[PDB]
Design a protein around this ligand. Structure first.
Ligand code: 74V
Ligand code: NAG
Length: 335
């Protein structure tokens, strides 16, 4: 059942690595900064019941069910195991406002929130934009609840991530459509390869085709900062670029950054090409300095992986439509 409404959420861009917007939970609304994440399916925010021995709970906005007159208890425990870290807590229900749309939503109140990585997060929590099939606890995701109301024009949502981390718009999510202000040319669509995941077939990864030669998978993950591949995939990619492996990233001498070759991802009969300016944090041009690349190793376990993940590095260049009605992802050139 489709309506006549389009809505948007304005996003903040923290340092090209974290894109997040505001949601309101409870009555009166308690405001949270949240990543809208196509790589997961659950909503969660940190809880007032989080021990303050978790220093991440000292430095973030905490949802207090005891301040909301529309809260409904559930209390079922949940653990969310991401590739970057784990959160745990319990289920609650309350009214959530996102882009002036109001829904009754089941979400996680997080009581265990490790310092790494969450002391490095500008955002407080996550809004899972994935499918109910990957929701821990089988909890109906927020976009499915919004769709139930019959207000949105289309069963789609779209992401714009800007390149500029103060006057500028950091990014934008359109619920119920896409914004022509932020893309140009036509959309090119790739249909989903697997039930309940924003994942597509990829036909090759080229440097200057030396990877994914007989096919592989790409998770399109709005909640991830970087492009990732498996450890073995990224090892071969990075040897070809001449980059040095550190603990949590790969780097190149800053003077070498501009000389680095294009990296192309073959998706649905189009080649999607990033130049070095799209994947190098070009912080200086000195030979004495090291500059980090926005491509990291991430071994994602079954059944989602092994897989590449196309995060904000990719989405900055390519405006992305997530089409629930037709089970496809559309890309167009961002502006
Ligand atoms: C939100 C948890 N995620 C992060 O990768 C992540 C971890 N830690 C920090 C500090 N930031 C993260 N995301 C920054 C960001 C926001 C939007 C674009 O990138 C992932 C978990 C797996 C599903 N996909 C999302
Ligand atoms: C204490 C409480 O509210 N428990 C509920 C349970 O009764 C319900 O079956 C489940 C699924 O919705 O959610 C939880």
């Amino acid at each position: 059942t489709l309506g006549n409404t389009t809505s948007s959420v304005i996003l903040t861009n923290y340092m090209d690595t974290q894109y997040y917007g505001e949601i309101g939970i409870g009555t009166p609304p308690q405001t949270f900064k949240v990543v809208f994440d196509t790589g997961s399916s659950n909503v969660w925010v940190p809880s007032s019941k989080c021990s303050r021995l978790y220093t991440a709970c000292v430095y973030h906005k905490l949802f207090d069910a005891s301040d909301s007159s529309s809260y409904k208890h559930n209390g079922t425990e949940l653990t969310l195991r991401y590739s970057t870290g784990t959160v745990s807590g319990f289920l609650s229900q309350d009214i959530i406002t996102v882009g002036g749309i109001t829904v009754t939503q089941m979400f996680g109140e997080v009581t265990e929130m490790p310092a790494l990585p969450f002391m490095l997060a500008e955002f407080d929590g996550v809004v899972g934009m994935g499918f109910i099939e990957q929701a821990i606890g089988r909890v109906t995701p927020i976009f499915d609840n919004i769709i139930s109301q019959g207000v949105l024009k289309e069963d789609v949502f779209s992401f714009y991530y800007n390149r500029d981390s103060s006057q500028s718009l950091g990014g934008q999510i359109v619920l119920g459509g896409s914004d022509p202000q932020h893309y140009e040319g036509n959309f090119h669509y790739i249909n989903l390869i697997k039930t309940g995941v924003w994942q597509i077939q990829m036909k090759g990864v080229s440097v200057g085709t030396l990877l994914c030669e007989d096919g592989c998978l790409a998770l399109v993950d709005t909640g991830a900062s970087y492009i990732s591949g498996s450890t073995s995939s990224i090892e071969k990619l990075m040897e070809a670029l001449g980059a040095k492996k550190r603990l949590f990233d790969y780097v190149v001498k800053c003077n070498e950054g501009p000389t680095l070759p294009d990296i192309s991802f073959h998706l649905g009969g189009k080649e999607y090409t990033l130049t070095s300016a799209d994947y190098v944090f070009q912080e200086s041009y000195s030979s004495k300095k090291l500059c980090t690349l926005a491509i990291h190793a991430m071994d994602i376990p079954p059944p989602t992986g092994p897989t590449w993940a196309l995060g904000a590095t990719f989405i900055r260049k390519f405006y992305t439509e997530f089409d629930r009605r037709n089970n496809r992802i559309g890309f167009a050139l961002a502006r």
